[PDB]
Amino acid sequence: MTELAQLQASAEQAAALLKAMSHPKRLLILCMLSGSPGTSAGELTRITGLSASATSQHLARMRDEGLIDSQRDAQRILYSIKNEAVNAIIATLKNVYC
Template identity: 50%
Template structure:
């Protein structure tokens, strides 16, 4: 359980808007999966397309939103744009979500 007395409710409230923006971006299943893929490392749109199952235009729209929220950043190499996670908080939240929703499969056989 989180002890808000230790964190300081005022300090948490000062960051609540930023936290809510991150959660809004992650609230879309496709954006969440894009960020999960980028958690593995930098990728181009062409590399992301088969991984996320979106059209190129839909993927580009989601990436633009993530870029607007400063969750991803880009690097250009010739005509190719590579995307990567820009905010380390994204990886921390995804790790917590994975821990909750993707528990390890037991290797024991019943």
């Protein structure tokens, strides 16, 4: 009950975060962005081994869900982690799987 009392008001938000992270290729992308100032789509396509279009869909959806944001200039678009909760969950997963 203490634990439940702690977290229940935030349960739909937490579950939503976990759901948006619950795809292995989104984890790879979130891992590469974590701690990075701005990574391009082309770089993320290489690390995930997805098509460019799949990479771009993952990115467009992740931004709309509030996980990541993007910085644009005349030449390109770069992505970064927006939601610090993502970085917290990535560090835990590290501590679990290593």
